[PDB]
Amino acid sequence: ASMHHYQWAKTPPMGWNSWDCYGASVTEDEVKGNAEYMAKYLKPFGWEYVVVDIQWYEPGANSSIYRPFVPLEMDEYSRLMPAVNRFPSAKGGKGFKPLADYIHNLGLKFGIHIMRGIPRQAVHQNTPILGTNVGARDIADTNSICPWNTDMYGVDHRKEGAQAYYDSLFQLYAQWGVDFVKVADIVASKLYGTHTEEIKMIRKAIDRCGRPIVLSLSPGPAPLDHATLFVENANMWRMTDDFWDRWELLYDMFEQCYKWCKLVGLGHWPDADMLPLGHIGIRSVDGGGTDRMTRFTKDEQRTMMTLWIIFRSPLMFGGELRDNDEWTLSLLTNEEVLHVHQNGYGARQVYRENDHVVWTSQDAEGNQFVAMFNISEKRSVVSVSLKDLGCMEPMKARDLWAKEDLGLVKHQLAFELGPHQSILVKLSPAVGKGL
Amino acid sequence: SMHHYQWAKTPPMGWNSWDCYGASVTEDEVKGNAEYMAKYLKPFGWEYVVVDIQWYEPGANSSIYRPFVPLEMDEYSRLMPAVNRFPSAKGGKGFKPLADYIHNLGLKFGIHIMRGIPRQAVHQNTPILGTNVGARDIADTNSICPWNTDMYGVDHRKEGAQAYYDSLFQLYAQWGVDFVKVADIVASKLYGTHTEEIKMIRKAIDRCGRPIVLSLSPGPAPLDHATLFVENANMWRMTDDFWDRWELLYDMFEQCYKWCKLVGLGHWPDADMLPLGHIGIRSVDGGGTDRMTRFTKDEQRTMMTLWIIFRSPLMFGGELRDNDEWTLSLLTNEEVLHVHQNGYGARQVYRENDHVVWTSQDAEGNQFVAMFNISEKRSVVSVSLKDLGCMEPMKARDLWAKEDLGLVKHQLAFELGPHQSILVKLSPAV
Amino acid sequence: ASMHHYQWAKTPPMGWNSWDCYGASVTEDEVKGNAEYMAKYLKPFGWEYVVVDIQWYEPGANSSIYRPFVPLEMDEYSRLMPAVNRFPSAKGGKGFKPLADYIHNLGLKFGIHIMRGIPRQAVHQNTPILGTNVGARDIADTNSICPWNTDMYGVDHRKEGAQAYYDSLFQLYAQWGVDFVKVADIVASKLYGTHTEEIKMIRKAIDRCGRPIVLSLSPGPAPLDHATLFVENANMWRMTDDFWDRWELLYDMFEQCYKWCKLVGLGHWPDADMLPLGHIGIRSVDGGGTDRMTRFTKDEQRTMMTLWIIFRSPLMFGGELRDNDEWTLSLLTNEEVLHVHQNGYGARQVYRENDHVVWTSQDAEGNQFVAMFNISEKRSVVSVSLKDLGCMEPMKARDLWAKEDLGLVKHQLAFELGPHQSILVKLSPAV
Amino acid sequence: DASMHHYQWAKTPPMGWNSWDCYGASVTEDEVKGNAEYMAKYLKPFGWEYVVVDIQWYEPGANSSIYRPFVPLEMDEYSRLMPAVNRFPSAKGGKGFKPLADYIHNLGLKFGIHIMRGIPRQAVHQNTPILGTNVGARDIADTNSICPWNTDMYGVDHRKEGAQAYYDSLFQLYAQWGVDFVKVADIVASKLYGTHTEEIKMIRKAIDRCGRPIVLSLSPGPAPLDHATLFVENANMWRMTDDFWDRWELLYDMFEQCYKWCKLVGLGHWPDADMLPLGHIGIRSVDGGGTDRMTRFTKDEQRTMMTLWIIFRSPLMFGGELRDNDEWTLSLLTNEEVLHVHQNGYGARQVYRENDHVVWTSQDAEGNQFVAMFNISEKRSVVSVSLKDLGCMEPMKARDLWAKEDLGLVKHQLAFELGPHQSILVKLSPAV
Ligand SMILES: O[C@@H]1[C@@H](O)[C@@H](O)OC[C@@H]1O
Ligand SMILES: O[C@@H]1[C@@H](O)[C@@H](O)OC[C@@H]1O
Ligand SMILES: O[C@@H]1[C@@H](O)[C@@H](O)OC[C@@H]1O
Ligand SMILES: O[C@@H]1[C@@H](O)[C@@H](O)OC[C@@H]1O
């Protein structure tokens, strides 16, 4: 806790993100619909961020597939702005402030996605930059683009006015009341790898703007080689390329959790990415799917929530919330599970063998959480000894998702679990307590 | 197999404005180099007058590009000469008048292009001749050149892509272009070799109805694409940009070794331009500025000798009009040039202790031997006749010196200083 | 004609190799049976080399899977020798000379495989090298092994005794009467790439032994980066990792031939590898198979022979020859087809599109050969215009495998071809 | 991090002496004993306790840092390398290192050895037994795993029956001898195979099964961050870098490696900046581009290195021949005030790095703040840092720890003119 911005995400951010349901193309009405649902059914459980994902500045976006080289909505200072057809309250140069105001009044927080860099249409016209006389063209990198989106060019920190530009972006965002930015094309790039210098300029720009804004970075895989950079400069960073509702990616996440578990801490959260639950693909064609309810089975959905919960990943719901059924809503409203996310710490892989995995973490009151997973293709008993958990005596055991006491455990936990199925258990002391 | 081979039966010889003028050569500088060539060089085979990169960039002024600037372009997305630097191009005539002039001097004309389609055309979605699709419809979304900002790559799968490239070589053919040096096409730090654009270019050339020699740059060309190059291009750069630095000339020896088996009629691995004479007038590359080549006279000869015996294309990179007599002599020795024009089979006989020997032959029995001391120490460099495949004594002649040397019984051997070479002809003794 | 050793392989070497049929484990009697069949049925068609493949020095070899870290027969100069149990004529220190004599007396030539380097056991025991007084241990490389075979360590050309050792190997092989050597762990290596310095040492050693020994390098893929080295130093070098009777490997060879076609020439032959035809996998387990007749369909077997013929690959039969049926023998003995391999030149890919591929070559007699291939998964017409072939008027066309005149062709060649099916056509001037 | 019982074996970063930088592969028993005695006498009160015999104690002809390849090695009947009795006479009679370690334990010190990953090639070639089993060394060897810079072993294949039994047997031996520390080589970086993760785990388990506390050190680096979890959970120490030597370029480079590794430092699991080339080194080593010599590090460089290792909390393993130290060299090892930062400091972080100026800070439980300030440029210059940037909320007492000299009150910032390659180590405490 050396870095002031850690205090802005004491626990891992929880919220909703338009990407998995709406792709690049979410409207004001949809945002607000999801915000209202959150306010009323989710906010008591920690869910507070409402994040407008990529390309809110792209008036014609209608998918997860971007329309390349198209005109973007922009101000007179080379800054992108919301598309007024999609966000009508943005009329009159108001930007996202009205939307942000309405979200804040719900008791909720406001987020946006930005692309690293400065828009290409700005560099080519050479539009001005607020606060300086250099123009957009003079701060652009001559060899730095995003391989999967044509909207921007990279900015070169070595040029006069580079920081001025980033500063000016975060002044705008701060005026609008943004509480959370998800930066893209910054951690992993086929072409260039991690854009470290822009991460630094962005941390600087946030710090200078005077409003607390949580910094999320994307896409992954984040290299461990930049662990220290990430831990000191970002509140979240994506461990993985885009996550979707396919078992192979959920399977894969276990190793990434294992590789990143030691960097997890207050204010600096490796990110397992958004939860493809409920109603997705409405205007997204990504993940090899279209308009659907998540292809994860119920066991898969639990398995994911359980891992993300115990690991302390940010939780960003990715479905259209208003179409949650009760099952889906139950995944988000169980306070006993969420305690593991909010107050747990120390999470670690106890072991992984024959596609059985066990993680454990604890709280400050001496409860110990254990998450046990069968990530194989067959039904099998998964178990762990109390000794391997560091429990030197017998313990009471409770199934947190079912909310049901399991009684006393003297030597080990052991459960028959179908393929892709898990269980999350709380262990609490038996010795020196009532009956 | 390939008809375009007949367009470069011997390796191209010429002049190129890059090393002396960077991106910024004027119509006057070109005219004057061409006039010097017609007068002093044409009899020895020098014929291409190549206008290098960025003739379409009115502001160009160095070897360092001005990025993201507007460029001169027609109404079908095709770049055009900058009228300020090329006054004869006024009124949409492009390069036809300069080329005409050059043709009327008995010479050929070439230009440099960048792979792809101008970024400004894609941004503005300007038309493509012969189609209803626009520039933006044929562009690659993830293809740029890492060291220049002018273009986006073209995506051969899009409708209209080949039409675009066709339309460029229609324009070049209207102008009378005889030679095109394509850039950002062979090696790319980001993407490697742009294979599919090499094929569209080949095809656009073939369809335009005029013989246009195809040169590919920058290198290093990968040996992995040897077939593609041999079959599609007349010349291809073995190396990133060559300059007047010993280390780069030293390095070329291995590259020539590496490529020697793909050298052949119509298809020439290219050791790049000759940074001789007066260079860096408006170029700042190679770690130098306005200067005469930093190669010593020995180094110049060593270079000329390797490029000659290997059969690299020869593109003089200095401002010819500032040649002194030494420099002119390197270009006007017929005996040496015969080795380039009519030699074949060049091969490295050996390389050992930074002594190197190359050999080639003509069809009339003559054997050429180039002997090189690329070490830092004076020494005798020798080679046996037997290792050259000569089974009895021969006569030797020093081709640069034009002097007979006498009978060689067993070995050719000379004292050579560091960086110094000799080129010898052997033929039957009396 | 710059390298004298080019004249040892003026046309692409043709023969039989024990690997595909017997793995590491062939016996003398098996070699002899194959050589007898070759002498009787194949020799006049050009087939002449009888090549004993890897580990003739490993008495317990029994498959294509090597027995690691086991003892190896060796002489008193650190040189591997044949296992007398498998090669009984080698009894009493005679090595392969008696078996080489037998094969020479059938009118045939004799080949062996060797592993690059010097035996590990020789380095550990520090046994002697002939012609010098450093031991084996002093010439070994300290960081060079084969990732897939444990027999040897690499030899370090910077050490005194290194060339002496390679020289001694080729003295022995020449004493034996070896005419061909296939060297392994030398072209491609997952750990180290191409072993160029050993290639040079072996070239020199062959040149010094005073017998023509054709030099074959393996396994691939050969990098184009070393094309000059290969061209000047070897008579054949493998374009590919080990080839087997699997359609996918056959599909993949089309590209490799394209990539190497400009280096094919007299004495220096890019090698598409041994032909997995007939009865293979008797004591081999490679290629995903066991004891079998080739899993290539007849169409695939024709496709392979067609490509290898026109491209001018060496032709090394990998099956047990005595189990050839008539069909299989016919693949090896079509005079008209062999003409393209023996007397053609200039092979090139005319095009490759939607998995249809056309190759062409010619002889000096006026004849142009065109090999047309459907390498797609569906029946389709494959075609090419006389013009794309560089043919300026009507030509008589003949199917070479079928030996059947197809008549006059005025504009193009066009054939319905099954998936994986091919045709080989000669075009000649209209009567 | 607190999960693993072996963390308790290295609560502070191991401190000791290692034979590599002074004697290569070639140290004798008398040299080990001499350095041990020196340690017991002059250094043990400041935390120095490990006496580590480096590589190739089993190679009787060894004579340098350059290995003699493919040579027969001293080995028991169970495929386990044994001390060369010519170099370690007290090992005569199959006693191995027990006598030597007993000697060192009696000085109140701890004993360390170096091992190469794997099983000896000669064991595999002869197919010598694996203790406690009916399998042979040949049955457990990998057929494609070697060290690119040493020929002594083949890798062990964890999937083979007996593989774990072999490693268990090694650590039974080492425990019998009384070994307290093992430096394992050819395990973290390999130009040919990368990190040998499965052998790391076999070794962890063998140690856990042997019944004695044995500190696990891994080498050589660079250790990839990609395996940070593995190293943190399985080892007490792991090399950040390839072998470190008395050259400035290598010292300069370590600054970035510490920056990269600083979040994985913690009780029981210490990223290692490698042994300290101080004093008399290169006596039977030819590595580092040097020969027999006193270290080529200037005093400033020596301090700069001590200071970064101190504040970062790298283990400290002296690589010179201790009996030849001067008072200067000794003074680097005996300053309690500096060592408190290594022993009791935590949270070490780079405050910033700019124009070859670097500042690190850490703190202790008493709210002292330690700050190390480095000029790693080629120019003399003033290096500074604000107390705001140190997160010191108000004015502070300052003290130069190496000089042991109060600097008085500091209100706004620390600033010092430092030579090139020169550093200072300061402690800030609350005022009055
Ligand atoms: O979730 C994805 C993310 O990886 C980003 O970089 O680009 C678009 C979406 O926001
Ligand atoms: O000679 C250089 C060449 O390498 C090319 O690629 O770019 C511009 C110049 O023409
Ligand atoms: O044909 C294979 C070959 O590729 C070689 O490298 O080793 C074994 C067989 O001889
Ligand atoms: O210190 C070096 C170390 O890096 C090891 O890997 O090899 C021998 C020495 O102990």
Domain segments of chain A as ranges: 1-345, 346-435
Task: Dig out the tokens for B73 from the structure.
Answer: 């372009």
Instruction: State the number of CA atoms in the 13 A half-sphere of C16 facing the CB.
Output: 32
Interchain contact C207–B (C-beta under 8 A): no
> How many residues does this entry show for chain B?
430
Give distance in angstroms: CA of C21 to centre of ligand 3: 13
Instruction: Tell which atom from ligand 2 comes closest to the C-alpha of B52.
Output: 10
Alpha helix (H) residue ranges in D178-326: 197-210, 228-234, 248-261, 299-312
Q: Measured between CA atoms, how close is D176 to chain A, in angstroms?
A: 27
| 3-state secondary structure (DSSP) of residue D93 | coil
Q: Are A278 and A319 in contact (CB under 8 A)?
A: yes
In chain D, what are the helix, strand and coil shares in percent, each to the nearest 5?
A: 30, 25, 45
Task: Dig out the tokens for B160 from the structure.
Answer: 């209209």
CA angle B238, B239, B245 (to 5 degrees): 135
Task: Dig out the tokens for B270 from the structure.
Answer: 């290219």
> How many residues does this entry show for chain C?
431
Neighbours of chain A (3+ CB pairs under 8 A): B, D
Task: Dig out the tokens for C336 from the structure.
Answer: 């008209």
Residue identified by tokens 């794997």 is D118
**Listed residue (A404, A331, A401, A395) closest to A367, CA to CA:** A395
| 3-state secondary structure (DSSP) of residue D159 | coil
D73/C272 Cα distance (integer angstroms): 45
C261/C348 Cα distance (integer angstroms): 6
In chain B, what are the helix, strand and coil shares in percent, each to the nearest 5?
A: 35, 25, 40
Q: Are D279 and D329 in contact (CB under 8 A)?
A: yes
Q: Are A179 and A216 in contact (CB under 8 A)?
A: no
Among chain C residues, the shortest Cα distance to B3 is held by C390
Give the torsion sign (CA, D305, D307, D312, D318).
positive
Who's near C105: CB < 8 A, 6+ residues apart? none
Determine the CATH number of domain A1-345. 3.20.20.70
Give yes or no for residue D359 CB within 6 A of ligand 4.
Answer: no
Domain C346-431 top-level CATH class: mainly beta
C397/C405 Cα distance (integer angstroms): 6
Q: Measured between CA atoms, how close is B123 to chain A, in angstroms?
A: 6
Alpha helix (H) residue ranges in A243-297: 247-260
Instruction: Tell which atom from ligand 3 comes closest to the C-alpha of C238.
Output: 4
Interchain contact A258–D (C-beta under 8 A): yes
Contact C120 D125 (CB under 8 A): yes
Beta-carbon count within 10 A of C415 CB: 17
Give distance in angstroms: CA of B183 to centre of ligand 2: 6
Interchain contact D69–C (C-beta under 8 A): yes
Give the torsion sign (CA, A240, A243, A247, A250).
positive
Give distance in angstroms: CA of C312 to centre of ligand 3: 20
Task: Dig out the tokens for D55 from the structure.
Answer: 């590589």
Q: How far, rounded to the nearest angstrom, does the alpha carbon of residue A136 sit from its chain's CA centroid?
A: 31
Asked whether this chain's domains A1-345 and A346-435 adopt the same fold, the reply is: no
A225, A261, A390 member nearest D229 (Cβ): A261
Q: Are A197 and A117 in contact (CB under 8 A)?
A: no
C70/C68 Cα distance (integer angstroms): 5
For the stretch D404-409, contacts whose Cβ atoms lie closer than 8 Å and that sit 24 or more positions apart, written own/partner, are: D404/D335, D404/D337
> Would you give the DSSP letter of residue C41?
I
**Listed residue (C200, C6, C19) closest to C113, CA to CA:** C19
| 3-state secondary structure (DSSP) of residue D147 | strand
D88/D94 Cα distance (integer angstroms): 11
A153/A156 Cα distance (integer angstroms): 10
Instruction: Tell which atom from ligand 1 comes closest to the C-alpha of A54.
Output: 10
What is the rounded radius of gyration, in angstroms, for the C-alpha atoms of chain C? 22
Task: Dig out the tokens for B275 from the structure.
Answer: 């940074």
* Torsion, CA A317, CA A318, CA A323, CA A325, rounded to 10: -50
Who's near A200: CB < 8 A, 6+ residues apart? A157, A233
C400/C381 Cα distance (integer angstroms): 19
> Would you give the DSSP letter of residue D427?
E
Beta-carbon count within 10 A of A330 CB: 13
Contact D226 A231 (CB under 8 A): no
Task: Dig out the tokens for A291 from the structure.
Answer: 């308009």
Task: Dig out the tokens for A283 from the structure.
Answer: 């205007």
If you count DSSP H runs as helices and E runs as strands, how many of each does chain A have, helices first? 11, 20
Q: Measured between CA atoms, how close is B199 to chain A, in angstroms?
A: 24
Beta-carbon count within 10 A of A106 CB: 16
Contact B389 C2 (CB under 8 A): yes
Beta strands in B203-312 (DSSP E): 213-216, 235-237, 268-270, 278-279, 291-292
Pairing mode of beta strands C214-217, C236-238: parallel
Measured from CB, residues less than 6 Å from any atom of ligand 1 are: A 19, 53-54, 113, 184, 218-219, 242
A308/A290 Cα distance (integer angstroms): 25
> What are phi and psi for residue C306, nearest 5 degrees?
-60, -45
A349/A293 Cα distance (integer angstroms): 31
Residue identified by tokens 């889906």 is A328
Q: Are D25 and D67 in contact (CB under 8 A)?
A: yes
B269/B290 Cα distance (integer angstroms): 29
For the stretch B236-239, contacts whose Cβ atoms lie closer than 8 Å and that sit 24 or more positions apart, written own/partner, are: B236/B186, B236/B268, B236/B269, B236/B270, B237/B186, B237/B187, B237/B270, B237/B272, B238/B269, B238/B270, B238/B271, B238/B272, B239/B271, B239/B272
B349/B360 Cα distance (integer angstroms): 10
D193/B101 Cα distance (integer angstroms): 64
Task: Dig out the tokens for D90 from the structure.
Answer: 């007290």
> What are phi and psi for residue A127, nearest 5 degrees?
-65, 160
> What are phi and psi for residue D116, nearest 5 degrees?
-90, 140
Task: Dig out the tokens for D221 from the structure.
Answer: 């680096």
- What stretch of H or E contains D399? strand D396-400
**Touch between chain C and chain A (3+ CB pairs, < 8 Å)?**
no
* Torsion, CA C196, CA C202, CA C208, CA C214, rounded to 10: -110
D114/B262 Cα distance (integer angstroms): 54
Q: Are C236 and C17 in contact (CB under 8 A)?
A: no
**Listed residue (D42, D136, D3) closest to D335, CA to CA:** D42
ω into residue A219 within 30 of 0, thus cis?
yes
Pairing mode of beta strands B117-118, B151-152: antiparallel
Pairing mode of beta strands D357-363, D346-354: antiparallel
| 3-state secondary structure (DSSP) of residue D428 | strand
What is the rounded radius of gyration, in angstroms, for the C-alpha atoms of chain A? 22
Q: Are A155 and A165 in contact (CB under 8 A)?
A: yes
Give distance in angstroms: CA of D315 to centre of ligand 4: 15
- C residues 130-169 near D, CB within 8 Å? 137, 140, 142-143, 145, 147-148, 150
Which numbered ligand comes closest to the C-alpha of A64? 1
Q: Are D424 and D389 in contact (CB under 8 A)?
A: no
Say whether domain B345-430 belongs to CATH 2.60.40.1180: yes
Give yes or no for residue D238 CB within 6 A of ligand 4.
Answer: no
CA angle A82, A87, A90 (to 5 degrees): 65
Q: Are C307 and C51 in contact (CB under 8 A)?
A: no
Give the torsion sign (CA, D87, D90, D95, D99).
negative
Give yes or no for residue B85 CB within 6 A of ligand 2.
Answer: no
Amino acid identity for residue C378 in this structure: K
Say whether domain B1-344 belongs to CATH 3.20.20.70: yes
Contact A68 B120 (CB under 8 A): no
CATH architecture group of domain D1-346: Alpha-Beta Barrel (3.20)
Please give the method by which this entry was determined.
Answer: X-ray
Contact C348 B261 (CB under 8 A): no
Among chain A residues, the shortest Cα distance to D263 is held by A228
Residue A142 region by backbone torsions, left for phi larger than 0, else alpha for psi between -120 and 50, else beta: alpha
- All residues of chain B having their beta carbon less than 8 Å from the beta carbon of residue C263 are 226, 261
**Listed residue (C310, C301, C372) closest to C339, CA to CA:** C310
Give the right CATH number for D347-432 from 2.60.15.10, 2.60.40.1180, 2.60.120.10, 3.20.20.70. 2.60.40.1180
B366/B384 Cα distance (integer angstroms): 16
CATH architecture group of domain A346-435: Sandwich (2.60)
Who's near C232: CB < 8 A, 6+ residues apart? B347, C2, C3, C268
| Sheet containing C356-362, strands listed edge to edge, beginning at the edge strand earlier in sequence | C345-353, C356-362, C368-374, C422-429, C395-399, C404-409
D385/D369 Cα distance (integer angstroms): 13
Q: How far, rounded to the nearest angstrom, does the alpha carbon of residue A179 sit from its chain's CA centroid?
A: 14
Which numbered ligand comes closest to the C-alpha of B270? 2
Beta-carbon count within 10 A of D340 CB: 17
